[PDB]
Design a protein around this ligand. Structure first.
Ligand code: F43
Ligand SMILES: C[C@@H](OP(=O)(O)O)[C@H](NC(=O)CCCCCCS)C(=O)O
Ligand SMILES: C[C@@H](OP(=O)(O)O)[C@H](NC(=O)CCCCCCS)C(=O)O
Ligand SMILES: O=S(=O)(O)CCS
Ligand SMILES: [Mg+2]
Ligand SMILES: [Xe]
Ligand SMILES: [Xe]
Ligand SMILES: [Xe]
Ligand SMILES: [Xe]
Ligand SMILES: [Xe]
Lengths: 442, 243, 547, 442
């Protein structure tokens, strides 16, 4: 192991699961459950067989309000969804005994597709999942009803949309969690271009499971981007543990101690007490009736402060049951804690900066939107390297229905299909088990 | 908690606004009906419109530990109250408010701008907060204003009466009474009956209570200990981002 | 006296120090000549087209306060703010068009292809014949095919091709009508630096027609340039009009030795080459030609760049490309009007000059903490002592940009290094926020709070010298009141050092050209001229339209 | 195995190596050597330590003709390359004795870097290789000389260039074979955005080895794009075998029988004879002194026609020792063979169409360039699904020095570094051996 740090792991109920776990046991580069989480997102595709049937029946393909009169095709796709999905799986799979999975949902109106891992071992990125799935279902529909050569192009438009005239799958009736690689803000960002609503949708509005999974995705992307390399690797691992994995029950205990009456300022005061109690910080200098705090471990102070930041979101936005205030919490938790202690805030100001623009682009006219439509690959919320988006996932989970663009509006196909995978719906479970299983191999 | 460093009256006034154990000095009496009238979200006696059904109508340890505010229990809309603070020795100031709001109030969504400062929360809980914001030393009827739009004035010169500029003139100074009357709600709709806002604080008390640094009051450059902490944060941020 | 005192006295009847005035009794929009013109024009527009348009009774009534005139800094021209809106200012529109329609294309690979693959000779005489050929073809005229229809020479009179080189003897042998004379345009020490950087290289400066640039987009420039370079290469050097070697010239002109003004942008802000978002702060400083005419006053050089960038980045780029509508006119004019930023920056220059001497200060955090703090406190105190100044720059964002620009430029005057100047910019923001318990608009300090830690970072999308950053730097990609000032901080240490350029010597030479429409040596003077409706732009269609 | 076809495998000398190998043993989804080639391309980065030193010494960073006067740093990077590369490998690797590889070349002026596969098992795409490599060497250089906080940003600019202001690594001193994911013409195209000069450079101008490697990359991308799925999978495997792998020695024998005096037309006549000899085609109808040929296996006729296309390129452009005529060969081999037989040409006209624009954009003014600057992700040459680019790789390999934009001009760092890996330099060797080892597992 490169680092000596050890952490105690807990479950989504505050119960201790494993004590003295090496820090690198939670690393995406080592944890086998995080590896299964990343690879599952890459290869999982939702197929809307009902949407394909309705698009063909009305010739409404290729984007919003689009229709080609005279091209209508009446095919009972949902009625034959079992045969169609079986025929597609035969083309999606590599061998009869690989990890290919095709399951029907909603009585055949939907299809969960997991492209086998063998195709990705010889692929450069992740686009094989939608492209192999789309062409397999297009061919399966054509073979099922013997669609003629002259009409088959309508099936293609109903499945994949206006591509390749549009760069995106504009009007497609398939869905994934990742977007096309061209829409990356930068190289290595693919695991960040996952809408918060997609995570909240498939976590079924569980706060800790959404917070854990968001931190897993955010910090895993930090490794692909190279940010979690060398001098910064320990800082991102500590942030993953204490902010997203509830290391040492710090997030859980802070929420419990301030849930009935607490505020953001009270969570800060308790965190500074806990950090001073655990030797993370110490009084470095005294001014006139003001103690200046210092530390010899900035990475650990950042992790503790990030833990209090997550708890402040759960206390502040949990009391309001409205996610919108998370941008204010992300801002002034960091603003107040800097003038309370004299130490830098989480991500050395990057969370406060992200929160400033996130507040603006969610309360104004120039763009953005609701807290659920943002993600790590958004220009507004890409700046903090994994310490801000996880707090939004916890906030959107607590929202009682105040968002116009909720996960039900933008992630309906995701919540029905991607929540079926147990790894993503309850990721805190599998990641804690995997860290314990590998704790003596690190 | 220390809240804020410094040895000036300004620094102490910032600590007082943030400290929930500091009882804010009440300067005026405003009825419950007048607070609802000033907000302009509903008529007095009108039921709270609901954005979603009440909470009583999934399993989550966080939801079970965080007691929701009364407005979230009923499903009230999220409404706002917004204040503009003159840079000429108004008691509260934009960042002072947001910092203080998130120390004192639960479930608060605060935003800071140069010409306005807003808090959003559940409607019935907003009314409870707005009473304290309007009656206590958070507010002065001459150097502060409740403005939901057209907030221009925080940096402008005062008028002959010492009132801050208001494009919509929501607060009128009465020369005959020496008191300020609010004739419109915060969005600019005329009220049926104006709301008495009391007398403006005199300039001596303004300088005792203000939280803005100025050369003709207490300069920020003279609060050397407060500047020292800000310079320290700048250096530590720089070093942390590098290594 | 403070440099802004005269402008403040022109704006208000009260003394600049008075804290009180009168409102609501000014007649609203009727106080203003410009608003009156707009109301009458809106009536004519609605009457002619049958749809309501401009109406002073929509929304809130403008003019409850003084609708201020603005002094364009370094001039004596006073205009209402509407005259500095880029839509109403033809000088501002032409400044961007002159940048958008420009591209730099080398001749070094092409001449190598001519001599090696084609086995033909390249001499100053052949270069002159090629240049005479390309200046016929570049505006849109034929040289090879029969029955070609062409562009009207008068509609495309602003398009041409020039060349420059560091070899004085070679430059003297090319026809001087096509040569940007480095020795005539730059002072001696600057000319020797630029000529040493260019060396024996020969570089074309291509400017495509403004009417095409306005009809199409920025990505058209390098393509339009390459086509006519390729046709003129075919004609002048007697190639087959379409053989294998002809493909080399096309790749050379389009990719191999081409310098775009702006690089393309990612998808969320999808844009091709030669758009403002792709222009790095170092290029923008070098496009501005104040460096070769005001080289003894580093403050004047730095602030002309601020004016160039504030108008382009905030008014045209962020205020239209990325948003639109009324826009961000006064967000930018705060940086080049009323001599406000000038007073603040001349103070910091003199402070640095007396204490350290220009470029003599240590390049460390101590110089940042000293210079940025002193200049910030001076700037913020001017608003506190002159209420007319605080009412003038009424937006906190405006004030934060002006104060931090002076603090950043001054710190760069001291260290001779743009990165410590950038650190002084963010320190100014932090001190400003604490002094007045306010800073900018709702989302002004996104980058400002990310700022300190990202000044000296080295990570993938965080670490870059300030000269290489631009509107696409992730923290900077969204918000007004920064980008134009960052360009000034990039110019600041090189102006104090006496450097001929900030980031690209070819870009600096490419705009030292008297055949441009916009005068990049006098950016603020051009803004005032366009505000007075005295600027003659290119690209008009009057010749092909009825009287 | 999904298909009944078997092929006989040969070497780059026309010698039989293994007989009756199932077709899918050559499949990218099954062949372990193709997997090793694709994964090696994803994780291999060249570092120009000499270029970084020169950039820092002159402050020439951030793009062509760019320089920041006053930023110069004099660091002896090449003199300390052993210590720098050792420190960088420590940050690049995940664990000790993993598949991390860092080798110095040119006396320390260059560095071959192979990022460990463990980082890619938890990554969505391939950008981790340059991003982790760049930041490790940036940190290693800073630690080696104790570069100050105020100067370190110049080391970052010297290594990775103007990113993120530019979308690309504009001015960087690292090189890969893949480009940034944003520059893909479409999803799944990453293995196609490999310049032909890059392939020819690291194959050291061996015709058959360049043809095999180009076909391996092109057809593997056809799987990631979804083109080689279902009804079209057999066509792409047959094209991979006969056109790129010298299946049944067909390309070799055609080149041998027409190498001394043959032309494109003579190669066509022999290919049509061989197809008629092997039962691939048969006389379907007789017109006036003209036999109309038909087939019951279009995929196999396409593979045979694709073999002759490669052989016609080797005969025509080999005789000229100039690559430029490949655009003409790709066009008129297909044009002539259709009126010679009455059957569709290679890729059902898509090779002929690709050749039309490829001829145009390599002999005109509107763009393109030399044959070596094209690739499968170029707008001009993306249209044929894997059957045209391999002939350009073979042609540029035969070019005796008539190209201005040769691999030495645009792929110098690739020719020096990426050729050192034996998998990439001689891919025909390993793919044939791997197919034989798995022949009884297919
Ligand atoms: C509706 C918003 C919210 C939003 O997303 N944009 C607005 C409005 C928008 C509109 C106003 C056009 C109009 O009046 O119809 C425009 C011009 C952008 C557009 N769509 O064309 C704009 N703001 Ni705003 N906006 C500005 C500013 C500001 C300052 C003004 C503070 C003051 O005390 O007056 C504050 C932010 C702050 O407090 O720091 C502000 C807020 C706001 N800004 C509040 C309205 C506040 C109010 O009710 O009065 N802007 C400025 O600080 C100066 C430059 C000015 C911009 C126009 C120009 O640059 O010429 C304008 C830039
Ligand atoms: C953020 C992003 O908007 P979206 O959130 O993607 O709608 C982006 N606009 C901007 O960055 C607005 C910049 C100009 C207006 C704000 C100036 S402070 C854009 O339009 O692509
Ligand atoms: C081929 C390609 O150019 P490059 O080879 O990438 O230089 C492409 N241009 C074109 O397609 C030119 C189209 C107009 C000129 C030809 C009309 S027949 C483009 O710029 O993207
Ligand atoms: O009020 S906001 O700051 O969002 C608008 C600034 S123009
Ligand atoms: Mg002129
Ligand atoms: Xe998810
Ligand atoms: Xe965020
Ligand atoms: Xe200069
Ligand atoms: Xe290669
Ligand atoms: Xe090709």
């Amino acid at each position: 192991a490169k680092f000596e740090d050890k952490v105690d792991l807990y479950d989504d109920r505050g119960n201790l699961v494993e004590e003295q776990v090496p820090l690198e046991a939670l690393s995406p580069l080592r944890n086998p459950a995080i590896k299964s989480i990343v690879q599952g997102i890459k290869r999982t595709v939702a197929v809307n067989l009902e949407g394909i049937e309705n698009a063909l029946k009305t010739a409404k393909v290729g984007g919003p309000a689009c229709k080609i009169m005279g091209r209508e095709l009446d095919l009972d796709i949902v009625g034959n969804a079992e045969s169609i999905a079986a025929a597609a799986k035969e083309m999606i799979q590599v061998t009869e005994d690989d990890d290919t999975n095709v399951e029907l949902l909603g009585g055949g109106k939907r299809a969960l597709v997991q492209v086998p891992s063998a195709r990705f071992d010889v692929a450069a990125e992740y686009s094989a999942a939608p492209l192999v799935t789309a062409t397999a279902f297009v061919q399966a529909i054509i073979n099922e009803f013997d669609v003629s050569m002259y009409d088959a192009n309508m099936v293609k438009a109903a499945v994949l949309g206006r591509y390749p005239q549009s760069v995106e799958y504009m009007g497609a009736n398939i869905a994934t969690m990742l977007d096309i690689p061209q829409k990356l803000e930068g190289p290595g960002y693919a695991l960040r271009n996952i809408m918060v609503n997609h995570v909240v949708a498939a976590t079924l509005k569980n706060t800790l499971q959404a917070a854990a999974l968001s931190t897993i995705l955010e910090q895993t992307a930090m490794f692909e981007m190279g940010d979690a390399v060398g001098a910064f690797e320990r800082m991102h691992l500590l942030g993953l543990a204490y902010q997203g994995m509830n290391a040492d029950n710090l997030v859980f205990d802070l929420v419990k101690a301030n849930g009935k009456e607490g505020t953001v300022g009270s969570v800060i005061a308790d965190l500074v007490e806990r950090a001073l109690e655990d030797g993370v910080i110490k009084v470095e200098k005294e001014l006139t009736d003001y103690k200046v705090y210092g530390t010899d471990d900035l990475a650990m102070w950042n992790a503790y402060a990030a833990a209090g930041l997550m708890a402040a979101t759960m206390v502040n936005q949990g009391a309001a049951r409205a996610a919108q205030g998370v941008s204010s919490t992300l801002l002034y938790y960091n603003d107040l804690i800097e003038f309370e202690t004299g130490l830098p805030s989480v991500d050395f100001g990057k969370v406060e900066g992200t929160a400033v623009g996130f507040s603006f682009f969610s309360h104004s006219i120039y763009g953005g939107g609701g807290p659920g439509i943002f993600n790590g690959n958004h220009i507004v919320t890409r700046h903090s390297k994994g310490f801000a988006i996880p707090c939004v996932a916890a906030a959107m989970a607590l929202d009682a229905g105040t968002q116009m663009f909720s996960p039900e509006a933008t992630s309906g196909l995701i919540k029905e299909v991607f929540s079926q995978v147990d790894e993503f719906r309850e990721p805190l479970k599998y990641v804690v088990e995997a860290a314990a299983e590998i704790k003596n191999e690190i | 908690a220390q809240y804020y460093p410094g040895t000036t009256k300004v620094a102490q006034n910032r600590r007082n606004f943030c400290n929930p154990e500091y009882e804010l000095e009440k300067l005026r009496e405003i009825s419950d009906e007048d607070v609802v009238k000033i907000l302009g979200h509903r008529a007095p006696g009108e039921e709270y419109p609901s954005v979603h059904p009440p909470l009583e109508e999934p399993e989550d340890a966080i939801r079970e530990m965080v007691e929701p505010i009364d407005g979230a229990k009923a499903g009230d809309r999220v409404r706002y109250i917004q204040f503009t603070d003159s840079m000429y020795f108004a008691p509260a100031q934009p960042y002072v408010r947001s910092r203080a709001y998130l120390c004192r109030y639960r479930g608060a969504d605060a935003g800071t701008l140069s010409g306005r400062q807003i808090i959003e929360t559940r409607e019935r809980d907003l009314e409870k907060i707005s009473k304290e914001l309007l009656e206590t030393e958070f507010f002065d009827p001459a150097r502060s204003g409740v403005r939901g739009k057209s907030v221009h004035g925080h940096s402008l010169r005062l008028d002959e009466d010492g009132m801050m500029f208001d494009m919509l003139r929501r607060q009128i100074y009465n020369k005959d009474t020496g008191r300020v009357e609010m004739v419109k709600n915060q969005i600019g709709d005329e009220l049926d009956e104006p709301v008495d806002l009391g007398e403006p604080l005199d300039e001596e008390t303004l300088m005792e209570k203000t939280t803005i640094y100025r050369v003709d009051g207490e300069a920020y450059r003279d609060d050397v200990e407060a500047v020292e902490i800000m310079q320290r944060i700048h250096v530590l941020r720089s070093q942390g981002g590098f290594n | 006296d403070k440099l802004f005192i005269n402008a403040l006295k022109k704006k208000f009847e009260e003394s600049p120090e008075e804290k009180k005035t009168t409102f609501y009794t000014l007649g609203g929009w009727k106080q203003s000549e410009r608003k009156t013109e707009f109301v009458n024009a809106g009536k004519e527009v609605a009457a002619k087209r049958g749809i309501p348009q401009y109406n002073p009774d929509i929304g809130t009534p403008l003019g409850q306060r003084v609708l201020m005139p603005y002094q364009v800094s370094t001039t004596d021209t006073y205009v209402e703010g509407d005259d500095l809106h880029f839509v109403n200012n033809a000088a501002m529109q032409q400044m961007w068009d002159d940048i958008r329609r420009t591209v730099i294309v080398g001749l070094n690979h092409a001449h190598a292809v001519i001599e090696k693959r084609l086995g033909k000779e390249v001499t100053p005489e052949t270069i002159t014949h090629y240049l005479e050929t390309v200046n016929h073809a570049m505006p849109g005229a034929a040289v090879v095919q029969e029955h070609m229809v062409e562009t009207h020479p008068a509609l495309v009179a602003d398009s041409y091709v020039k060349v420059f080189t560091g070899n004085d003897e070679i430059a003297d042998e090319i026809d001087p009508a096509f040569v940007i004379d480095i020795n005539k345009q730059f002072p001696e020490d600057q000319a020797e630096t630029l000529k040493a950087e260019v060396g024996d290289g020969i570089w074309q400066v291509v400017r495509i027609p403004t009417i095409v640039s306005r009809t199409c987009d920025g990505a058209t420039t390098s393509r339009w340039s390459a086509m006519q370079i390729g046709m003129s290469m075919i004609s002048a050097y007697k190639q087959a009009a379409g053989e294998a070697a002809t493909g080399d010239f096309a790749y050379a002109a389009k990719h191999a030795e081409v310098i775009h003004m702006g690089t393309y942008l990612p998808v969320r802000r999808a844009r091709g080459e030669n758009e403002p978002g792709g222009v790095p702060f170092g290029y923008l400083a070098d496009i501005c030609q104040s460096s070769r005419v005001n080289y003894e006053d580093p403050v004047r050089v730095s602030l002309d760049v601020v004016a160039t960038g504030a108008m382009l980045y905030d008014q045209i780029w962020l205020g239209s490309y990325m948003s639109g509508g009324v826009g961000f006119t006064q967000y930018a004019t705060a940086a080049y009007t009323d001599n406000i930023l000038d007073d603040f920056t001349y103070f910091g220059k003199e402070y640095v000059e007396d204490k350290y001497g220009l470029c003599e200060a240590p390049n460390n955090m101590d110089t940042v903490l000293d210079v940025a703090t002193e200049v910030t406190f001076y700037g913020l105190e001017q608003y506190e002592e002159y209420p007319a100044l605080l009412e003038d720059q009424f937006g906190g964002s405006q004030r934060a940009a002006v104060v931090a620009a002076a603090a950043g430029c001054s710190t760069a005057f001291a260290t001779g290094n743009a990165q410590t100047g950038l650190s002084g910019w963010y320190l100014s923001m932090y001190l400003h926020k604490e002094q007045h318990s306010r800073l900018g608009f709702y989302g002004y300090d996104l980058q400002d709070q990310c700022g300190a830690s990202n000044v000296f970072s080295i990570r993938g999308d965080e670490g870059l010298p300030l000269e290489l950053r631009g509107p696409n730097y992730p923290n900077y990609a969204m918000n007004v009141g920064h980008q134009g000032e960052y360009a000034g901080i990039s110019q600041a240490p090189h102006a104090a050092r006496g450097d001929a350029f900030v980031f690209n010597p070819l870009v600096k030479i490419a705009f030292a050209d008297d055949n441009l429409v916009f005068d990049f040596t006098n950016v603020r003077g051009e803004f005032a001229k366009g505000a007075l409706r005295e600027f003659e732009p290119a690209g008009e269609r009057a010749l092909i339209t009825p009287a």
